[model samples]
Target: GMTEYKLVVVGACGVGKSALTIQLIQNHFVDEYDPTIEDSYRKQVVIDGETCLLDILDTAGQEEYSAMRDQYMRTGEGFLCVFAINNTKSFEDIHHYREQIKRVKDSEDVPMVLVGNKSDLPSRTVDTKQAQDLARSYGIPFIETSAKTRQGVDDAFYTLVREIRKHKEK
Candidate 1:
């Protein structure tokens, strides 16, 4: 059976939500990147012989649209918390995103993936190990990806879905 899932890609603006979504669905890259104004919605990503319709919501950057972001968190089934490896601020703010997810989700057991974006630009990395450690602390999976390079992007999303499916079976 094909299951429909709602996945949220949340983080500060400019972390690479649109790029990641574009890569997942279209398998293309934008030469000129743009920051998401409000939020973008996307659905249905087929990978590894499974099709999952994901209603991906890209929340506005910190404190800009807390109300709307909070609402989405309240109803979102899964989350991919993104942070740019080049931007330390983006990395630091992930705790806030995690807190919001914890407060909004129906269950504490909700599945999430901590994604360290821009892995292709290693010179600009801020905190890859810290991201992995935090994911461990929260009992979630973590992976580094680069939408520009198409590195680890698909695997990150797939890992989260696999976790969600496992939880659903229980």
Candidate 2:
């Protein structure tokens, strides 16, 4: 049997949310920083030897449209809370995203993954330990990715898919 999952990619502006989304579905990195309102992509992937259809929604990070986030969160089965490894502010804001999802879903145990993007950059500020600590605190999985190098990009999506699948099984 096949399953379908709705996943949302959210983060602060310039955290490479759109870039990571485009990379996963399109297999290409986007260098531009154009803000997104909401972009959806559909892809079929094999998870645990079963076909799974993923409907991914890439959301805008701007604060003006914060009201719309709850609607997306309500419909999403899983979430990827992305943050740039070099940007401490973006890393700090991930809590807000996680909180919003929990509040909107009315569940403390939402399927989510913490993604630290731009892993290829050398000017690192947010250490891996810090990000891992945060993920540990939230009891969520954390992954580092670089859309430019295409490293861990696929894992980020696949990890969330697996988490969603596991949650459904329980």
Relative to the unseen true structure, what is the C-alpha lDDT of residue 38 in candidate 2, on a scale of 0 to 100? 69
Provide the overall lDDT of each model, using Cα atoms, as 2-decimal numbers.
0.79, 0.88
lDDT digits (tens) for residues 1-170 of candidate 1: 46777778888778888788778767887644556454546667775688767666666544644776568567777889999989989888998888878877746788899999888885675766777788999899998999988999889888888878878988
Candidate 1's C-alpha runs over 4 A off are 46-49, 61-69
Error of 2 at 166 (Å): 1.4
Query: What is the per-residue lDDT of model 2 for residues 37-109, given as tens digits with 9 covering 90 to 100?
Result: 5678898888768888889998884564355666756899999999999999999999998988898889999
State TM-scores per candidate: 0.85, 0.93
The Cα RMSD of model 1 versus the native structure comes to 2.5
- Report, for all candidates in order, the number of backbone clashes: 0, 0
TM-score, cand. 1:
0.85
